Symmetry: C3
Subunit: 314 residues, 3 copies
C-alpha cells in the first residue's frame, strides 16, 4: 500500500513573483492531507522547510538569487532523501520549479535508477549561460543532466550539486514555450518529449503508452513526477507565474497521473508553481488549487471510474 | 422515416433540488418541437404527465420520497409503453434521472430486447442499501438490473417493478463520480463502461465503435439512450444538480448522438436533469437548454456535415 | 527559406456586418509583421488595397453587393498574382471570405496546380441560386470550382472569373454549419471533407495525415490555405460574424498549420473574417486577434516544440 511523506517548500526566489511561497499553505487548507487519508493513504507531514533569508545574494552574471535557490534545493534534497530512506513516497508542495534540483537530487541519492516524467509548458533546461531571463526556475534540468556537465558554470550556491540523471531518463509532456537554447539542447541530447504538437497528433492515450514503455520497457524502476501546474491550460490553472495558452486539459492531467499511479512505481512527486496571489479573482485561485489537489489525488489512487475497499458492498 | 412521441415528465423528488420540474417547459420554449419538425420529423406531443402530490411519503430507511418517485415512474412506464405501441420513438423530457426506471421499463414492455446506452457522470446504480444520500436519482439502474434482484428491498412505491435488463445490455459513457458501492457492482457484474479515463485513452471515436459493436454485434435490437445532461462538462451544461468537472465536451456529446442516430435503431430517448433554477446567470440556463436541444436534434438526424432533402438542389 | 508578401484586404461587402474591414489594421497593430521578422521570415508589405466605393450596386436577385464583391476580388487576384510572380508566399489579411475568389484566382494564375485547404465552420459553396441569405462570403467556392460552371449565373462584377480549381483539389476541415444546397453539392461532387464529426472520430492527427496524403500523394504541388477564423470555436475567436459552437480548438488550429508549414509547400494564405467590432468585450477582440496571429506564425514556422538557429547554443 502507498505511504506518503509531505514536504512543504515555501520558496519563490527561482523567479520574480513572490506569492508562490504560499503554495504549500493553500494546498494544505484545501484539505489535501485529509483527502489523501480519505483514500488509501498513510500520510506523514514533514512540515514546511524553514528557508533562511540570504540577504547578500547578488546575481551571478545574469542569474538571479543563486545562493538562495541553491541552499533551498540543498535543504530540500536532504529532506527528500530522509523521507525516501523512511520508505515513503515524497510529496513536495512548491514553491517555484527551481526546487526540482533538490527534489530529484535527494530522491536519486536513495534511488539512483529513477526515471523522470516532467509535465510542463516548459523544458526548464536553460543553462546559466543560455538563459536570457536569469530566473533559475527555468534552469533546473540543466543542473541535473550528466551530459551537460562542463557546460554549467560554478554558480555560487550550487557546489553541492552532482548531476544524477542521464538525458535518456527523462520524458517531457506538455511543451509549448521552449527557448531556442533549450530546443538546441533537446535535439542535441536526444531527449524524449511530447510537446503539445505530439499530444495533438497522437492523443494523450498513446502519449502515456509511449512515455511509460520508454521509461520502463527494459527494467522496472522508481518514477519521479515533476508536475508544474502551468503544464495544464490557464483555463484550469490560471494562478501561476508563466501561463501559456494551448495547454493540457484537466482530463489530460488526470489521465497522465492516473496512468502513472497504475504503474505502482511512483516514488517521488513535485506539485509546483501554484501562486494564489496571481489569481485575477478568488475563483481563479480556488480553481487552480482544486485542480492541483485533484492531480495529486489521482497520483495516489483516486480513479475516475471509481474506487472500492476489498469487501462485499452488497 | 423517424416518428417521435414527446412525453414531459416534470418530476423532481428523486433528488433534493426543486427546479428540475421545469425541464420540459424550458426545453419546449426553446422550440424543441418546432426544430424537430424543421428536420425530417413527424412529432406528436403526448403532454406533460400530471404527477399527483403524495404528501404522505416518509423515508424508507435513508431513501427519500420513495412513494412519489415510484408512482411517477409507474405512470411514465405506462405512457412510454403507450407511445411505443403506436410505433413512435419515445422522447422523455425530464425531470430527474429516477424517471429512467419508468422510461426503460415502459420501453421494455414493448421491446424486451433493448440495449441501453447511459451517458452520465454517474452510474446511478446504488441500491436502497448502498446509497449514502438516499436520493433515488442515483439508484435507477439497480432497480432495472436482473442480476441485482434479491438485493433490492421492498421499497414502498416500487412493487410494480420487474427488472427488465441484464447487466450485459447496458453501456455507460462519461463516468467520473462513482461511489464505492457502485464501483463494486460495476466490477462484480462485469458491466461495460467508458469512464472519462477510457474516453481520454481511446478517443470518443473508438468509444462509440466499441459501444455499438458490443451492443449490436450479435443481433440488431432497439436502443434506449438515457442522456443525463451532467454527462457533459459543466462548461456546457451548468444548470444541473450534480455537476462534475472534467466531462464530455459538446463535440463528444454530438458525436455520441450522431453515431447513435446513424444506427437506425434509436427507439427510446431520455433527456434528463436540466434544472434552469440552478443557473448562476440567465446565460448559463440558455447554454444548458441550447446544448440539450442540440443533443436531442442530433439523436433525430441533424448532422454537423449537413443534411439535404432527396431532390436536385442545383 | 520562406519569403512573404503581405496584402491587406479591408473589405466587408460580402456580408452584412461592417467591422471586418478593420481586420488588416488590428492584425498589423498586434505586431504581425514584426513577429514574422522575429522568426525566420523576409517580409514585404504590399499595403492595404484601395477598394473604390461602388455606390450603385443593387442586388442581383437575392445576391447583395455583387459589383463591390466582384471588383474587390478582381483587384485582389491581380495583387496576389503579382506577389506570386515575385516568388513570395502571399499572405492576405481580410476582410470577409468572399475575397477567397480573388486570392485563389490570383494564386492559380501563377500556380495552376495548387491544392486548397479550407479551414472553416462553413463550406462557403452556395451558388447565387442556392443561397438563401444572398451574402457572397458564403459563396466563393462555387465560383472557383470547374464542375459547377453552367450553374453559376452571369452575376454583375464577376465576368472576369474563370473557375480554376477542380472538386478533387480542395479539402475542408472544421465543418459544422452546412446549408442543404451546400451539402448536396458536397456529396454530388465528391469533395473531400472533415466536418467536426470526422475530427471527433479520427482525431486531428489522422485528419491532417489524410488531408495531406490526399492532396500531395500523387504529386507535390503548391498549397493554398484559406483560414476563416470561425473555423475555431468562438471561445477562441469570438469576434467574427458567423460564429458556430463546437469548433476546432486553439490546439487543433495550431496543429493544422504546423503540419501545413512542415510540407514546405505553403504557397498562399488567407486569414479571414476577423471582426473586432463584434467583440462583446475588449478581451474578446484581443483573444481573437492573438489567436489569428498565432495561427499565422505557425504557418510560417513557429513550432510549439521550439525553434533554433543553425548554430551551437552551448
Ligand atoms: C521558457 N523560458 C523562460 C520561462 C521559464 C519558466 C519556468 B517554469 O518552471 O514555469 O517552467 C522564459 C524566457 N522567455 C521569456 C519571454 C521572452 C523570451 C524568453 C525563462 O525564464 O527561462
Ligand atoms: C454518485 N452518487 C450520488 C450522486 C447521484 C447523482 C444522480 B444523477 O442522475 O445526477 O446521475 C452522490 C453520492 N456522494 C455525495 C457526495 C459525497 C459522497 C457520496 C448519490 O446521491 O448517490
Ligand atoms: C451557412 N451559410 C450561411 C453562412 C455563410 C458564412 C460564410 B463565412 O465565410 O463565414 O464562412 C448562412 C445561411 N443560413 C443562415 C441561417 C438560417 C439558415 C441559412 C450563408 O449566408 O450562406
Ligand atoms: Mn512551466
Ligand atoms: Mn517548470
Ligand atoms: Mn448524473
Ligand atoms: Mn443520472
Ligand atoms: Mn465561416
Ligand atoms: Mn468562410
Amino acid at each position: 500500500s502507498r505511504t506518503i511523506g509531505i514536504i512543504g517548500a515555501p520558496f519563490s526566489k527561482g523567479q520574480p513573483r513572490g506569492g508562490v511561497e504560499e503554495g504549500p499553505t493553500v494546498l494544505r487548507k484545501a484539505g489535501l492531507l485529509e483527502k489523501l487519508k480519505e483514500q488509501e493513504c498513510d500520510v506523514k507531514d514533514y512540515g514546511d522547510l524553514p528557508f533562511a533569508d540570504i540577504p547578500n545574494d547578488s546575481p551571478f552574471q545574469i542569474v538571479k538569487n543563486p545562493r538562495s535557490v541553491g541552499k533551498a534545493s540543498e535543504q530540500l534534497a536532504g529532506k527528500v532523501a530522509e523521507v525516501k530512506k523512511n520508505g515513503r513516497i515524497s510529496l513536495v508542495l512548491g514553491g517555484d520549479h527551481s526546487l526540482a534540483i533538490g527534489s530529484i537530487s535527494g530522491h536519486a541519492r536513495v534511488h539512483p535508477d529513477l526515471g523522470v516524467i516532467w509535465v510542463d509548458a516548459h523544458t526548464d533546461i536553460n543553462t546559466p549561460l543560455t538563459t536570457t531571463s536569469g530566473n533559475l526556475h527555468g534552469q533546473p534540468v540543466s543542473f541535473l543532466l550528466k551530459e551537460l556537465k562542463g557546460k554549467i558554470p560554478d554558480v555560487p550556491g550550487f557546489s553541492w550539486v552532482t548531476p544524477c540523471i542521464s538525458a535518456k531518463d527523462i520524458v517531457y509532456i506538455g511543451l509549448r514555450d521552449v527557448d531556442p537554447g533549450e530546443h538546441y539542447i533537446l535535439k542535441t541530447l536526444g531527449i524524449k518529449y511530447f510537446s503539445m504538437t505530439e499530444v495533438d497528433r497522437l492523443g494523450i492515450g498513446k502519449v502515456m503508452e509511449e512515455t511509460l514503455s520508454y521509461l520502463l520497457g527494459r527494467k522496472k524502476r522508481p518514477i519521479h513526477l515533476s508536475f508544474d501546474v502551468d503544464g495544464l491550460d490557464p483555463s484550469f490553472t490560471p494562478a501561476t507565474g508563466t501561463p501559456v495558452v494551448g495547454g493540457l486539459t484537466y482530463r489530460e492531467g488526470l489521465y497522465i497521473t492516473e496512468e502513472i499511479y497504475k504503474t505502482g512505481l511512483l516514488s517521488g512527486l513535485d506539485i509546483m508553481e501554484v501562486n494564489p496571489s496571481l489569481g485575477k479573482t478568488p475563483e481563479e485561485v480556488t480553481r487552480t488549487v482544486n485542480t492541483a489537489v485533484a492531480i495529486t489525488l489521482a497520483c495516489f489512487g483516486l480513479a475516475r471510474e471509481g474506487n472500492h475497499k476489498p469487501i462485499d458492498y452488497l
